[PDB]
């Protein structure tokens, strides 16, 4: 139940994914993501992330879903060694409670929806500012689920959308 154990097994499997395999996994995950948003009309501004090597990718039809329903996307901008903010494509900043939902990147998650991040703590600190009970949604591959004890500084996440 050690975090190091997981982090190692996951980074291993993520890099090993074949271009054909990743494609299929992301397609199914973005399909599930859209199925999740479709019935949540009050989501008009959503926080995404910039896909780093091996992370689940946001596919072309996902963004199409956003354009069609007029949902604005905001991205994370590291502001310091401990803080991050969200800005849109024009660099307009969006305050925490201007965002209606957060799609969160992760290395691992356990049975209690806890997140195993990249060790910086940005998300944990940022998410403390929410006052509208915005959904905190993890995006990941099924093999990213592991068994570890969560520290109070690990985000709890309402749900982790994955390929299953």
UniProtKB/Swiss-Prot annotation:
Magnesium. It can also use divalent cations such as manganese, calcium, zinc, iron, cobalt and copper. Keywords: ATP-binding, Cytoplasm, Ligase, Magnesium, Metal-binding, Nucleotide-binding. Its cofactor is Mg(2+); Mn(2+); Ca(2+); Zn(2+). Its main location: cytoplasm. InterPro entries: FTHF_cligase, FTHF_cligase-like_sf, NagB/RpiA_transferase-like. It catalyses: (6S)-5-formyl-5,6,7,8-tetrahydrofolate + ATP = (6R)-5,10-methenyltetrahydrofolate + ADP + phosphate. Its EC number is 6.3.3.2. It is found in: Cytoplasm. Mg(2+) binds at residues 124, 154. It comes from Mycoplasma pneumoniae (strain ATCC 29342 / M129 / Subtype 1). Belongs to the 5-formyltetrahydrofolate cyclo-ligase family. GO terms for cellular component: cytoplasm. Involved in folate metabolism. Catalyzes the irreversible conversion of 5-formyltetrahydrofolate (5-FTHF) to yield 5,10-methenyltetrahydrofolate. Pfam families: 5-FTHF_cyc-lig. This is 5-formyltetrahydrofolate cyclo-ligase. Substrate binds at residues 50, 55. GO terms for molecular function: 5-formyltetrahydrofolate cyclo-ligase activity; ATP binding; metal ion binding. GO terms for biological process: folic acid-containing compound biosynthetic process; tetrahydrofolate interconversion. ATP binds at residues 3-7, 115-123, 125, 153. Monomer or homodimer. The keyword Isomerase does not apply. It comes from the Bacteria.
């Amino acid at each position: 139940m050690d975090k190091n154990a997981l982090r190692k097994q996951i980074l291993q499997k993520r890099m090993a994914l074949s271009t054909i395999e990743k494609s299929h996994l992301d397609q199914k995950i973005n399909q599930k993501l859209v199925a999740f948003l479709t019935p949540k009309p009050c989501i008009k501004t959503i926080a995404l992330y910039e896909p780093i090597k091996n992370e689940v990718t946001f596919v072309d039809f996902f963004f199409e879903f956003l354009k069609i329903n007029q949902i604005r996307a905001v991205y994370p901008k590291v502001i310091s060694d401990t803080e991050i903010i969200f800005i849109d494509q024009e660099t307009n900043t969006f305050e925490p409670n201007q965002i209606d939902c957060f799609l969160i990147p992760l290395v691992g998650f356990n049975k209690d929806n806890y997140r195993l991040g990249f060790g910086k703590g940005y998300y944990d600190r940022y998410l403390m500012q929410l006052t509208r009970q915005q959904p905190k949604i993890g995006i990941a591959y099924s093999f990213q689920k592991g068994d570890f004890l969560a520290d109070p500084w690990d985000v709890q996440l309402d749900l982790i959308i994955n390929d299953e």
